[PDB]
Amino acid sequence: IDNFLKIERLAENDLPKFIQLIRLFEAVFEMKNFSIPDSEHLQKLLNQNNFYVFVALLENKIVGGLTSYVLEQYYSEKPLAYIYDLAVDTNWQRQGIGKKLITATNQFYTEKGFEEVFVQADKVDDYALDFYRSTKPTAEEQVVHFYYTLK
Amino acid sequence: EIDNFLKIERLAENDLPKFIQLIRLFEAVFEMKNFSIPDSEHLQKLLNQNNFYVFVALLENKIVGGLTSYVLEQYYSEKPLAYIYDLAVDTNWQRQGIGKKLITATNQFYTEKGFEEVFVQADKVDDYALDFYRSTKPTAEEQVVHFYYTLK
Numbered sequence A: 001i002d003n004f005l006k007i008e009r010l011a012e013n014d015l016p017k018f019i020q021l022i023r024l025f026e027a028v029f030e031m032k033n034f035s036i037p038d039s040e041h042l043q044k045l046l047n048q049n050n051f052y053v054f055v056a057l058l059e060n061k062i063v064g065g066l067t068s069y070v071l072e073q074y075y076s077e078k079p080l081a082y083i084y085d086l087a088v089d090t091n092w093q094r095q096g097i098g099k100k101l102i103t104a105t106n107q108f109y110t111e112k113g114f115e116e117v118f119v120q121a122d123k124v125d126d127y128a129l130d131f132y133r134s135t136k137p138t139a140e141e142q143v144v145h146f147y148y149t150l151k
Numbered sequence B: 001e002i003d004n005f006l007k008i009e010r011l012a013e014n015d016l017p018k019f020i021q022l023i024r025l026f027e028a029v030f031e032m033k034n035f036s037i038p039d040s041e042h043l044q045k046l047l048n049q050n051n052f053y054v055f056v057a058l059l060e061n062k063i064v065g066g067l068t069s070y071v072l073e074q075y076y077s078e079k080p081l082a083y084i085y086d087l088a089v090d091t092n093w094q095r096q097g098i099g100k101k102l103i104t105a106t107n108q109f110y111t112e113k114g115f116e117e118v119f120v121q122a123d124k125v126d127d128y129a130l131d132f133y134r135s136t137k138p139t140a141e142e143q144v145v146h147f148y149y150t151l152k
């Protein structure tokens, strides 16, 4: 596939590819009764200087991607990147696409002089864990994630 | 009994000195090795960002606790998320409600701003932090794994 596959970092004139990726997230994550935000909101997000999206393309079809947030640090002038979502179309999994997305993401942030990139996976998702373990991370740590649903 | 002396405040752009005090508190409580604080130009730039909010606890004008939080605009909703990144309380003033009041003020702030959710993480080996967050009425907790790629 590495003759056909293209990895692309989205820019501000890439809203259609971004929407395609959000729809892939909806599909792969099996999100229920999802209503996509209006395009104006999604464009503002894409225009943020702390947000970077990477996609995998076959021809003009988005077949995978990931989203990431920049966290400027107070411990270092070298920022963190937080990978928020990563998905590959079920029809194109096990073809190296996820690994290529992680590699491209980390290379980009390396060139930008970042300290570290990190990502979260659920402890019961053994295949996600297998995947991230195969990308040669520096460290892996058990974490408890808490949230507060606001009124 | 500091209940009537404790002040909880959200840092403004003129609060670099309190921000630096908080960062030193983090260095002490988290026992950080070989820490060189970034220069103040960088720290001021961060404090100036409109997607970064710091809450502190004060006894008089001494910082005795605080937390840092990042706004994450979503593509799943127009309502943002807030990510609490660090929270610490002076070892001399722990287990006296300071952490709880910081979390309450933080969630109240983001509620008023119409955010969807505030989230925070603790290392599984950090028994103290886990018992703390479980005492703040979180909506839920999830067992997860973090993977880190430290860059050259």
Ligand SMILES: OC[C@H]1O[C@H](O[C@H]2O[C@H](CO)[C@@H](O)[C@H](O)[C@H]2O)[C@H](O)[C@@H](O)[C@@H]1O
Residues within 6 Å of the ligand: A029, A083, A084, A085, A120, A121, A122, A125, A128, A145, B142, B144
């Ligand atoms: O495909 C596996 C799961 O991916 C997502 O969940 C991960 O990413 C979330 C957003 O950063 C985290 O909150 C979560 O802890 C991770 O597991 C997706 O939301 C899940 O539905 C998928 O099953």
Ligand SMILES: [Ca+2]
Residues within 6 Å of the ligand: A008, A009, A010, A011, A013, A014
């Ligand atoms: Ca493009």
Ligand SMILES: [Ca+2]
Residues within 6 Å of the ligand: A028, A029, A030
């Ligand atoms: Ca799933």
Ligand SMILES: [Ca+2]
Residues within 6 Å of the ligand: A012, A046, A047, A048, A049
């Ligand atoms: Ca921009």
Ligand SMILES: [Ca+2]
Residues within 6 Å of the ligand: A077, B039, B042
């Ligand atoms: Ca510098």
Ligand SMILES: [Ca+2]
Residues within 6 Å of the ligand: B034
């Ligand atoms: Ca030393």
Ligand SMILES: [Ca+2]
Residues within 6 Å of the ligand: B013, B047, B048, B049, B050
């Ligand atoms: Ca500002």
Ligand SMILES: [Ca+2]
Residues within 6 Å of the ligand: none
């Ligand atoms: Ca979730």
Ligand SMILES: [Ca+2]
Residues within 6 Å of the ligand: B151, B152
């Ligand atoms: Ca280096």
Ligand SMILES: [Cl-]
Residues within 6 Å of the ligand: A088, A092, A093, A094, A095, A096, A097, A098, A099
């Ligand atoms: Cl894959």
Ligand SMILES: [Cl-]
Residues within 6 Å of the ligand: B089, B093, B094, B095, B096, B097, B098, B099, B100
């Ligand atoms: Cl406390």
